[PDB]
PDB file of C-alpha atoms (C1' of nucleotides) and ligand atoms in Angstrom:
ATOM      1  CA  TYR A  64       2.723  60.071  -2.051  1.00  0.00           C
ATOM      2  CA  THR A  65       5.302  58.080  -3.984  1.00  0.00           C
ATOM      3  CA  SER A  66       5.536  54.601  -5.530  1.00  0.00           C
ATOM      4  CA  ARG A  67       7.299  53.294  -2.589  1.00  0.00           C
ATOM      5  CA  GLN A  68       3.886  52.751  -0.915  1.00  0.00           C
ATOM      6  CA  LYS A  69       2.874  50.334  -3.773  1.00  0.00           C
ATOM      7  CA  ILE A  70       5.356  47.745  -2.630  1.00  0.00           C
ATOM      8  CA  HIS A  71       6.088  46.218   0.950  1.00  0.00           C
ATOM      9  CA  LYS A  72       8.779  43.615   0.804  1.00  0.00           C
ATOM     10  CA  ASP A  73       9.305  41.389   3.837  1.00  0.00           C
ATOM     11  CA  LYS A  74      11.285  42.606   6.711  1.00  0.00           C
ATOM     12  CA  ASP A  75      11.606  45.742   5.075  1.00  0.00           C
ATOM     13  CA  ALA A  76      14.037  44.510   2.503  1.00  0.00           C
ATOM     14  CA  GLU A  77      15.279  46.765  -0.333  1.00  0.00           C
ATOM     15  CA  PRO A  78      13.541  45.689  -3.520  1.00  0.00           C
ATOM     16  CA  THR A  79      15.615  45.327  -6.675  1.00  0.00           C
ATOM     17  CA  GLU A  80      15.085  47.200  -9.673  1.00  0.00           C
ATOM     18  CA  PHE A  81      12.288  45.134 -11.339  1.00  0.00           C
ATOM     19  CA  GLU A  82       9.988  45.737  -8.176  1.00  0.00           C
ATOM     20  CA  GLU A  83      10.415  49.236  -8.291  1.00  0.00           C
ATOM     21  CA  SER A  84       9.641  49.259 -11.932  1.00  0.00           C
ATOM     22  CA  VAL A  85       6.665  47.257 -11.218  1.00  0.00           C
ATOM     23  CA  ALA A  86       5.737  49.804  -8.350  1.00  0.00           C
ATOM     24  CA  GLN A  87       5.847  52.483 -10.700  1.00  0.00           C
ATOM     25  CA  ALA A  88       3.808  50.940 -13.162  1.00  0.00           C
ATOM     26  CA  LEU A  89       1.235  50.267 -10.390  1.00  0.00           C
ATOM     27  CA  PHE A  90       1.165  53.840  -9.354  1.00  0.00           C
ATOM     28  CA  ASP A  91       0.988  55.244 -12.979  1.00  0.00           C
ATOM     29  CA  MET A  92      -1.862  52.845 -13.332  1.00  0.00           C
ATOM     30  CA  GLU A  93      -3.601  54.156 -10.183  1.00  0.00           C
ATOM     31  CA  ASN A  94      -3.294  57.787 -11.320  1.00  0.00           C
ATOM     32  CA  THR A  95      -3.545  58.064 -14.729  1.00  0.00           C
ATOM     33  CA  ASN A  96      -6.623  55.420 -15.340  1.00  0.00           C
ATOM     34  CA  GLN A  97      -9.419  56.699 -13.628  1.00  0.00           C
ATOM     35  CA  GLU A  98     -11.719  53.430 -13.796  1.00  0.00           C
ATOM     36  CA  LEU A  99      -8.876  51.654 -11.823  1.00  0.00           C
ATOM     37  CA  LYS A 100      -8.186  54.695  -9.619  1.00  0.00           C
ATOM     38  CA  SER A 101     -10.606  53.652  -7.036  1.00  0.00           C
ATOM     39  CA  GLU A 102      -9.388  50.111  -6.567  1.00  0.00           C
ATOM     40  CA  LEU A 103      -5.643  50.491  -6.914  1.00  0.00           C
ATOM     41  CA  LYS A 104      -5.394  53.288  -3.706  1.00  0.00           C
ATOM     42  CA  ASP A 105      -5.350  50.404  -1.204  1.00  0.00           C
ATOM     43  CA  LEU A 106      -3.143  47.465  -2.980  1.00  0.00           C
ATOM     44  CA  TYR A 107       0.190  46.788  -2.731  1.00  0.00           C
ATOM     45  CA  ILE A 108       2.452  44.100  -3.747  1.00  0.00           C
ATOM     46  CA  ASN A 109       4.618  41.945  -1.650  1.00  0.00           C
ATOM     47  CA  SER A 110       7.400  41.527  -4.401  1.00  0.00           C
ATOM     48  CA  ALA A 111       7.614  40.951  -8.133  1.00  0.00           C
ATOM     49  CA  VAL A 112       9.960  38.242 -10.016  1.00  0.00           C
ATOM     50  CA  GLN A 113      10.858  37.700 -14.053  1.00  0.00           C
ATOM     51  CA  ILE A 114      10.674  34.068 -15.255  1.00  0.00           C
ATOM     52  CA  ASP A 115      11.491  32.940 -18.673  1.00  0.00           C
ATOM     53  CA  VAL A 116       9.083  30.621 -20.127  1.00  0.00           C
ATOM     54  CA  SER A 117      10.288  30.283 -23.578  1.00  0.00           C
ATOM     55  CA  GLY A 118      12.665  31.758 -26.190  1.00  0.00           C
ATOM     56  CA  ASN A 119      12.141  35.488 -26.889  1.00  0.00           C
ATOM     57  CA  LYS A 120       9.627  35.198 -24.495  1.00  0.00           C
ATOM     58  CA  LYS A 121       9.408  35.750 -20.438  1.00  0.00           C
ATOM     59  CA  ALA A 122       6.892  35.957 -17.535  1.00  0.00           C
ATOM     60  CA  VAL A 123       6.815  38.251 -14.514  1.00  0.00           C
ATOM     61  CA  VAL A 124       5.173  36.666 -11.630  1.00  0.00           C
ATOM     62  CA  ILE A 125       3.715  39.309  -8.720  1.00  0.00           C
ATOM     63  CA  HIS A 126       3.615  38.638  -5.241  1.00  0.00           C
ATOM     64  CA  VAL A 127       0.883  40.123  -3.361  1.00  0.00           C
ATOM     65  CA  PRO A 128      -0.289  40.081   0.485  1.00  0.00           C
ATOM     66  CA  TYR A 129      -2.626  37.340   1.380  1.00  0.00           C
ATOM     67  CA  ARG A 130      -5.550  39.516   3.188  1.00  0.00           C
ATOM     68  CA  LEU A 131      -5.592  41.451  -0.507  1.00  0.00           C
ATOM     69  CA  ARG A 132      -5.703  38.370  -2.541  1.00  0.00           C
ATOM     70  CA  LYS A 133      -9.893  38.545  -2.955  1.00  0.00           C
ATOM     71  CA  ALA A 134      -9.120  42.513  -3.866  1.00  0.00           C
ATOM     72  CA  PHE A 135      -6.915  41.748  -6.561  1.00  0.00           C
ATOM     73  CA  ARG A 136      -8.870  38.598  -7.757  1.00  0.00           C
ATOM     74  CA  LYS A 137     -11.984  40.902  -8.383  1.00  0.00           C
ATOM     75  CA  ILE A 138      -9.997  43.308 -10.721  1.00  0.00           C
ATOM     76  CA  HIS A 139      -7.455  40.837 -12.054  1.00  0.00           C
ATOM     77  CA  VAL A 140      -8.251  40.770 -15.715  1.00  0.00           C
ATOM     78  CA  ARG A 141      -8.094  44.471 -16.256  1.00  0.00           C
ATOM     79  CA  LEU A 142      -4.988  45.064 -13.938  1.00  0.00           C
ATOM     80  CA  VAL A 143      -3.187  42.021 -15.883  1.00  0.00           C
ATOM     81  CA  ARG A 144      -4.424  43.384 -19.586  1.00  0.00           C
ATOM     82  CA  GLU A 145      -3.029  46.736 -18.872  1.00  0.00           C
ATOM     83  CA  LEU A 146       0.127  45.876 -17.274  1.00  0.00           C
ATOM     84  CA  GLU A 147       0.839  43.287 -20.204  1.00  0.00           C
ATOM     85  CA  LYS A 148       0.763  46.195 -22.913  1.00  0.00           C
ATOM     86  CA  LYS A 149       3.574  47.922 -20.585  1.00  0.00           C
ATOM     87  CA  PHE A 150       6.204  44.866 -20.513  1.00  0.00           C
ATOM     88  CA  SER A 151       5.829  44.320 -24.118  1.00  0.00           C
ATOM     89  CA  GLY A 152       4.364  40.887 -24.284  1.00  0.00           C
ATOM     90  CA  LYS A 153       5.267  39.809 -20.901  1.00  0.00           C
ATOM     91  CA  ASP A 154       2.309  37.393 -19.011  1.00  0.00           C
ATOM     92  CA  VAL A 155       1.686  38.839 -15.599  1.00  0.00           C
ATOM     93  CA  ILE A 156       0.565  36.570 -12.559  1.00  0.00           C
ATOM     94  CA  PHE A 157      -0.712  37.140  -9.341  1.00  0.00           C
ATOM     95  CA  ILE A 158       0.095  34.387  -6.519  1.00  0.00           C
ATOM     96  CA  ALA A 159      -0.864  35.303  -3.006  1.00  0.00           C
ATOM     97  CA  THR A 160       1.997  35.169  -0.278  1.00  0.00           C
ATOM     98  CA  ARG A 161       1.496  32.079   1.964  1.00  0.00           C
ATOM     99  CA  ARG A 162       3.770  30.416   4.339  1.00  0.00           C
ATOM    100  CA  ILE A 163       4.717  26.732   4.564  1.00  0.00           C
ATOM    101  CA  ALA A 164       5.769  24.990   7.730  1.00  0.00           C
ATOM    102  CA  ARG A 165       7.703  22.040   8.102  1.00  0.00           C
ATOM    103  CA  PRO A 166       6.104  18.946   9.646  1.00  0.00           C
ATOM    104  CA  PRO A 167       6.825  18.528  13.168  1.00  0.00           C
ATOM    105  CA  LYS A 168       9.621  16.554  14.355  1.00  0.00           C
ATOM    106  CA  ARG A 169       8.733  12.713  15.568  1.00  0.00           C
ATOM    107  CA  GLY A 170       7.407  12.800  18.845  1.00  0.00           C
ATOM    108  CA  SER A 171       6.916  16.604  19.065  1.00  0.00           C
ATOM    109  CA  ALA A 172       3.497  17.947  20.664  1.00  0.00           C
ATOM    110  CA  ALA A 173       3.540  20.943  17.967  1.00  0.00           C
ATOM    111  CA  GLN A 174       0.668  21.147  15.810  1.00  0.00           C
ATOM    112  CA  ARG A 175       0.746  22.699  12.231  1.00  0.00           C
ATOM    113  CA  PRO A 176      -2.346  23.884  10.542  1.00  0.00           C
ATOM    114  CA  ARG A 177      -3.132  22.011   7.248  1.00  0.00           C
ATOM    115  CA  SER A 178      -3.245  25.292   5.224  1.00  0.00           C
ATOM    116  CA  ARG A 179       0.183  25.594   6.085  1.00  0.00           C
ATOM    117  CA  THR A 180       1.215  22.292   4.685  1.00  0.00           C
ATOM    118  CA  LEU A 181       3.082  21.893   1.468  1.00  0.00           C
ATOM    119  CA  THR A 182       0.685  20.155  -0.450  1.00  0.00           C
ATOM    120  CA  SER A 183      -2.151  22.798   0.508  1.00  0.00           C
ATOM    121  CA  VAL A 184       0.108  25.704  -0.606  1.00  0.00           C
ATOM    122  CA  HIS A 185       0.994  24.126  -3.779  1.00  0.00           C
ATOM    123  CA  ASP A 186      -2.589  23.397  -4.454  1.00  0.00           C
ATOM    124  CA  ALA A 187      -3.561  26.947  -3.639  1.00  0.00           C
ATOM    125  CA  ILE A 188      -0.476  28.305  -5.915  1.00  0.00           C
ATOM    126  CA  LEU A 189      -2.041  26.159  -8.666  1.00  0.00           C
ATOM    127  CA  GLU A 190      -5.434  27.717  -8.198  1.00  0.00           C
ATOM    128  CA  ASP A 191      -4.328  31.072  -8.399  1.00  0.00           C
ATOM    129  CA  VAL A 192      -2.098  30.879 -11.376  1.00  0.00           C
ATOM    130  CA  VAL A 193      -4.665  29.721 -13.724  1.00  0.00           C
ATOM    131  CA  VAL A 194      -6.760  32.761 -12.840  1.00  0.00           C
ATOM    132  CA  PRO A 195      -9.456  33.239 -14.235  1.00  0.00           C
ATOM    133  CA  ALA A 196      -9.828  29.652 -15.222  1.00  0.00           C
ATOM    134  CA  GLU A 197     -11.354  27.259 -12.774  1.00  0.00           C
ATOM    135  CA  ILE A 198      -9.706  23.913 -12.387  1.00  0.00           C
ATOM    136  CA  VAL A 199     -12.462  21.041 -13.038  1.00  0.00           C
ATOM    137  CA  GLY A 200      -9.856  18.172 -12.897  1.00  0.00           C
ATOM    138  CA  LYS A 201      -6.546  16.762 -12.173  1.00  0.00           C
ATOM    139  CA  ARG A 202      -4.319  13.897 -13.494  1.00  0.00           C
ATOM    140  CA  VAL A 203      -1.363  12.487 -12.109  1.00  0.00           C
ATOM    141  CA  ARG A 204       0.645  10.078 -14.590  1.00  0.00           C
ATOM    142  CA  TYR A 205       3.604   8.135 -13.469  1.00  0.00           C
ATOM    143  CA  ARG A 206       5.853   7.361 -16.425  1.00  0.00           C
ATOM    144  CA  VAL A 207       7.921   4.322 -16.529  1.00  0.00           C
ATOM    145  CA  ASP A 208      11.187   5.991 -16.034  1.00  0.00           C
ATOM    146  CA  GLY A 209      10.059   7.562 -13.093  1.00  0.00           C
ATOM    147  CA  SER A 210       8.959  11.263 -13.903  1.00  0.00           C
ATOM    148  CA  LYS A 211       5.264  12.452 -12.929  1.00  0.00           C
ATOM    149  CA  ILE A 212       3.303  14.659 -15.167  1.00  0.00           C
ATOM    150  CA  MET A 213       0.262  16.447 -13.890  1.00  0.00           C
ATOM    151  CA  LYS A 214      -2.770  17.110 -16.317  1.00  0.00           C
ATOM    152  CA  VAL A 215      -4.868  19.999 -15.111  1.00  0.00           C
ATOM    153  CA  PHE A 216      -8.380  20.564 -16.957  1.00  0.00           C
ATOM    154  CA  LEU A 217      -9.607  23.800 -16.948  1.00  0.00           C
ATOM    155  CA  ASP A 218     -13.105  25.333 -17.582  1.00  0.00           C
ATOM    156  CA  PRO A 219     -13.743  26.033 -21.274  1.00  0.00           C
ATOM    157  CA  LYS A 220     -15.414  29.325 -20.616  1.00  0.00           C
ATOM    158  CA  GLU A 221     -11.948  31.227 -19.761  1.00  0.00           C
ATOM    159  CA  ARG A 222     -10.302  29.717 -23.010  1.00  0.00           C
ATOM    160  CA  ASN A 223     -10.120  32.895 -24.790  1.00  0.00           C
ATOM    161  CA  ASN A 224      -8.219  34.466 -21.683  1.00  0.00           C
ATOM    162  CA  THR A 225      -6.023  31.441 -20.794  1.00  0.00           C
ATOM    163  CA  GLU A 226      -5.400  29.543 -23.966  1.00  0.00           C
ATOM    164  CA  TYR A 227      -2.119  31.715 -24.794  1.00  0.00           C
ATOM    165  CA  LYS A 228      -0.999  31.336 -21.224  1.00  0.00           C
ATOM    166  CA  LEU A 229      -0.635  27.929 -20.943  1.00  0.00           C
ATOM    167  CA  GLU A 230       3.194  27.605 -21.488  1.00  0.00           C
ATOM    168  CA  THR A 231       3.433  30.283 -19.061  1.00  0.00           C
ATOM    169  CA  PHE A 232       1.363  28.522 -16.643  1.00  0.00           C
ATOM    170  CA  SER A 233       3.685  25.463 -16.693  1.00  0.00           C
ATOM    171  CA  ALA A 234       6.878  27.707 -16.700  1.00  0.00           C
ATOM    172  CA  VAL A 235       5.691  29.519 -13.658  1.00  0.00           C
ATOM    173  CA  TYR A 236       4.416  26.643 -11.457  1.00  0.00           C
ATOM    174  CA  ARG A 237       7.747  24.339 -12.273  1.00  0.00           C
ATOM    175  CA  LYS A 238       9.890  27.116 -11.070  1.00  0.00           C
ATOM    176  CA  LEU A 239       7.499  27.834  -7.904  1.00  0.00           C
ATOM    177  CA  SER A 240       7.394  23.940  -6.724  1.00  0.00           C
ATOM    178  CA  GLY A 241       9.584  21.844  -9.430  1.00  0.00           C
ATOM    179  CA  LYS A 242       6.209  20.121 -10.724  1.00  0.00           C
ATOM    180  CA  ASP A 243       5.760  19.396 -14.448  1.00  0.00           C
ATOM    181  CA  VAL A 244       2.191  20.380 -15.117  1.00  0.00           C
ATOM    182  CA  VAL A 245       0.552  20.215 -18.645  1.00  0.00           C
ATOM    183  CA  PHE A 246      -3.185  22.319 -19.149  1.00  0.00           C
ATOM    184  CA  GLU A 247      -5.968  20.746 -21.256  1.00  0.00           C
ATOM    185  CA  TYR A 248      -9.633  21.909 -21.919  1.00  0.00           C
ATOM    186  CA  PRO A 249     -12.449  19.486 -21.659  1.00  0.00           C
ATOM    187  CA  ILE A 250     -14.009  18.525 -25.082  1.00  0.00           C
ATOM    188  CA  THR A 251     -17.674  19.159 -25.085  1.00  0.00           C
TER     189      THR A 251
ATOM    190  C1'   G B 146      -5.062 -62.829   5.755  1.00  0.00           C
ATOM    191  C1'   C B 147      -3.297 -68.277   6.365  1.00  0.00           C
ATOM    192  C1'   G B 148      -5.220 -73.739   8.018  1.00  0.00           C
ATOM    193  C1'   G B 149     -11.885 -77.521   6.455  1.00  0.00           C
ATOM    194  C1'   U B 150      -7.171 -84.126   3.431  1.00  0.00           C
ATOM    195  C1'   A B 151      -2.181 -81.985  -3.112  1.00  0.00           C
ATOM    196  C1'   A B 152      -0.813 -75.619   3.069  1.00  0.00           C
ATOM    197  C1'   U B 153       5.053 -70.894  -0.885  1.00  0.00           C
ATOM    198  C1'   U B 154       1.955 -68.612   5.518  1.00  0.00           C
ATOM    199  C1'   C B 155       1.378 -73.823  10.912  1.00  0.00           C
ATOM    200  C1'   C B 156       5.035 -78.351  12.650  1.00  0.00           C
ATOM    201  C1'   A B 157       9.681 -80.134  10.619  1.00  0.00           C
ATOM    202  C1'   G B 158      13.879 -81.180   6.491  1.00  0.00           C
ATOM    203  C1'   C B 159      16.586 -78.995   2.713  1.00  0.00           C
ATOM    204  C1'   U B 160      17.198 -74.557   0.326  1.00  0.00           C
ATOM    205  C1'   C B 161      17.328 -69.358   0.378  1.00  0.00           C
ATOM    206  C1'   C B 162      17.113 -64.175   2.388  1.00  0.00           C
ATOM    207  C1'   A B 163      18.399 -59.653   6.099  1.00  0.00           C
ATOM    208  C1'   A B 164      21.978 -57.981   9.897  1.00  0.00           C
ATOM    209  C1'   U B 165      25.970 -59.762  11.963  1.00  0.00           C
ATOM    210  C1'   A B 166      29.032 -59.909  17.117  1.00  0.00           C
ATOM    211  C1'   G B 167      24.991 -58.797  17.106  1.00  0.00           C
ATOM    212  C1'   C B 168      19.620 -59.561  16.825  1.00  0.00           C
ATOM    213  C1'   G B 169      14.416 -60.371  18.556  1.00  0.00           C
ATOM    214  C1'   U B 170      10.389 -58.557  21.476  1.00  0.00           C
ATOM    215  C1'   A B 171       7.416 -55.412  24.924  1.00  0.00           C
ATOM    216  C1'   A B 172       7.726 -44.819  26.657  1.00  0.00           C
ATOM    217  C1'   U B 173       8.379 -41.130  23.186  1.00  0.00           C
ATOM    218  C1'   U B 174       9.827 -38.851  18.026  1.00  0.00           C
ATOM    219  C1'   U B 175       9.044 -38.777  12.491  1.00  0.00           C
ATOM    220  C1'   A B 176       6.415 -39.984   8.782  1.00  0.00           C
ATOM    221  C1'   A B 177       1.673 -36.095  10.581  1.00  0.00           C
ATOM    222  C1'   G B 178      -0.416 -30.466   6.247  1.00  0.00           C
ATOM    223  C1'   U B 179      -3.719 -36.847  11.178  1.00  0.00           C
ATOM    224  C1'   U B 180      -3.168 -29.878  16.134  1.00  0.00           C
ATOM    225  C1'   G B 181      -1.995 -26.963  10.315  1.00  0.00           C
ATOM    226  C1'   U B 182       1.567 -19.488  13.098  1.00  0.00           C
ATOM    227  C1'   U B 183       4.421 -21.075   8.142  1.00  0.00           C
ATOM    228  C1'   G B 184      -0.103 -24.994   6.907  1.00  0.00           C
ATOM    229  C1'   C B 185      -5.254 -28.766   7.738  1.00  0.00           C
ATOM    230  C1'   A B 186     -10.588 -28.931   7.759  1.00  0.00           C
ATOM    231  C1'   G B 187     -16.619 -27.484   8.564  1.00  0.00           C
ATOM    232  C1'   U B 188     -22.996 -28.449   1.493  1.00  0.00           C
ATOM    233  C1'   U B 189     -23.361 -34.330   1.030  1.00  0.00           C
ATOM    234  C1'   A B 190     -16.950 -37.821   4.670  1.00  0.00           C
ATOM    235  C1'   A B 191     -16.723 -35.419  11.418  1.00  0.00           C
ATOM    236  C1'   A B 192     -18.175 -30.389  11.531  1.00  0.00           C
ATOM    237  C1'   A B 193     -21.629 -22.670  10.818  1.00  0.00           C
ATOM    238  C1'   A B 194     -25.063 -21.544  17.429  1.00  0.00           C
ATOM    239  C1'   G B 195     -32.676 -21.346  15.071  1.00  0.00           C
ATOM    240  C1'   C B 196     -32.108 -16.024  14.943  1.00  0.00           C
ATOM    241  C1'   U B 197     -30.757 -11.133  16.486  1.00  0.00           C
ATOM    242  C1'   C B 198     -28.442  -7.602  20.064  1.00  0.00           C
ATOM    243  C1'   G B 199     -24.120  -7.041  22.892  1.00  0.00           C
ATOM    244  C1'   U B 200     -19.407  -5.794  26.716  1.00  0.00           C
ATOM    245  C1'   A B 201     -14.464  -7.639  27.146  1.00  0.00           C
ATOM    246  C1'   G B 202     -11.074  -9.333  22.955  1.00  0.00           C
ATOM    247  C1'   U B 203      -9.176  -8.894  17.957  1.00  0.00           C
ATOM    248  C1'   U B 204      -9.450  -5.609  13.879  1.00  0.00           C
ATOM    249  C1'   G B 205     -10.265  -0.727  11.671  1.00  0.00           C
ATOM    250  C1'   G B 206     -10.573   3.839   5.024  1.00  0.00           C
ATOM    251  C1'   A B 207      -7.960   8.269   2.948  1.00  0.00           C
ATOM    252  C1'   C B 208      -4.901  12.693   4.128  1.00  0.00           C
ATOM    253  C1'   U B 209       0.275  16.659   6.298  1.00  0.00           C
ATOM    254  C1'   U B 210       7.928  17.943   2.767  1.00  0.00           C
ATOM    255  C1'   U B 211       8.156  16.508  -2.610  1.00  0.00           C
ATOM    256  C1'   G B 212      12.063  18.529  -6.417  1.00  0.00           C
ATOM    257  C1'   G B 213      15.962  20.331  -8.442  1.00  0.00           C
ATOM    258  C1'   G B 214      20.600  22.741  -8.319  1.00  0.00           C
ATOM    259  C1'   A B 215      24.486  21.093  -7.039  1.00  0.00           C
ATOM    260  C1'   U B 216      28.622  18.542  -4.445  1.00  0.00           C
TER     261        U B 216
HETATM  262  K1    K C 226      -3.129 -86.565   3.921  1.00  0.00           K
HETATM  263  K1    K C 227      -0.354 -82.855   2.894  1.00  0.00           K
HETATM  264  K1    K C 228       4.608 -65.501   5.511  1.00  0.00           K
HETATM  265 MG1   MG C 229       2.692 -79.832   2.457  1.00  0.00          MG
HETATM  266 MG1   MG C 230       8.998 -73.630   6.692  1.00  0.00          MG
HETATM  267 MG1   MG C 231      -8.134 -34.057   8.257  1.00  0.00          MG
HETATM  268 MG1   MG C 232     -25.540 -38.054   6.891  1.00  0.00          MG
HETATM  269 MG1   MG C 233     -21.941 -34.778   8.056  1.00  0.00          MG
HETATM  270 MG1   MG C 234     -26.827 -27.056  12.235  1.00  0.00          MG
HETATM  271 MG1   MG C 235     -23.641 -16.863  23.687  1.00  0.00          MG
END
RNA sequence: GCGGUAAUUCCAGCUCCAAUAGCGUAAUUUAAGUUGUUGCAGUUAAAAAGCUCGUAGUUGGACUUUGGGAU
């Protein structure tokens, strides 16, 4: 089969050139690499986007089906390290696709699951962005000027894997939810 | 509170004071945060049932869409 099977855009939309490039990269990863050949046969991405994080640096965010989030997680590290070498120093982020439902209008009898609330989806996205790190604390500081800055504490165990991705995580989260977040490692 | 033999307080004279064609005397408001919703009290001044349960009544933790771009 072709690489088009690795990309499934919503409503069968036509992907851009970056989606095609990422799908091709995944296809060659499945084919050439034997260790990941078994895992990647039934894995496809919903969409792929590019976000700039700093001068002369950029990051690529890949959205994957919700039902395959566990499968992607169990192979996250190898896949990210293999894909990074192909984009010339661009970090790769996997975020499961989720739907946000607006609150029911006042007086309506419609009920919305709490998982579909904006806050729950934002928390899930924040949990997914720092993979493989695990969040161990959260602080929100309300500045005098009226701005909010959130501090997220990550487990030091994944320091070697996450330390260099902090700025990319901040930029990606800001783009995805418009929230200012900083990452720090507890001292101990 | 005055008056019991030196009475600014009674009975009078004089003088003086308040209001003034008005003034005195015999339900109700304010003052009253002395009925307190605003806004009172309950150790010793009046005051929390000997103790617990308990239906009416009153009261009841947190959580679900924020932000920027612009205009
Ligand atoms: K006498
Ligand atoms: K006398
Ligand atoms: K008198
Ligand atoms: Mg006399
Ligand atoms: Mg006289
Ligand atoms: Mg009293
Ligand atoms: Mg007594
Ligand atoms: Mg008493
Ligand atoms: Mg008693
Ligand atoms: Mg009784």
